[PDB]
Amino acid sequence: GEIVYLPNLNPDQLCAFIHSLHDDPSQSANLLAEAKKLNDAQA
Amino acid sequence: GEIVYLPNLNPDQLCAFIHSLHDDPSQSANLLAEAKKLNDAQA
């Protein structure tokens, strides 16, 4: 499926991100969008 | 680039790894070896 890279993201954000992926599998896709936006927002 | 996948690692483990990975970039290769060990250990 679609892939999302987190280069400019903050490590704490990554932990929170991975936590959200686990909280609800269906949300992972939506979380991927926001998470991906952070890479741009924190870029 | 060599790409690694850790689906077997729990969020706490990935968080621990990501913190250690970030805190010690010089040891990123060695630390990854452990996560790869985890990949097998959590297999």
Binding site: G1, E2, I3, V4, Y5, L6, P7, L9, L14, F17, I18, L21, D24, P25, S26, Q27, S28, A29, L31, L32, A35 | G1, E2, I3, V4, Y5, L6, P7, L9, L14, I18, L21, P25, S28, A29, L32
Partner: peptide
């Protein structure tokens, strides 16, 4: 360099946490 990324795999797994190691793929 190392990079953390999530792959959309659907299923009950949602996405998979994978990281890149060195340079660019």
């Amino acid at each position: 360099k190392l990079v953390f990324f999530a792959e959309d795999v659907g299923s009950n797994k949602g996405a998979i946490i994978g990281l890149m190691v060195g340079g660019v793929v």
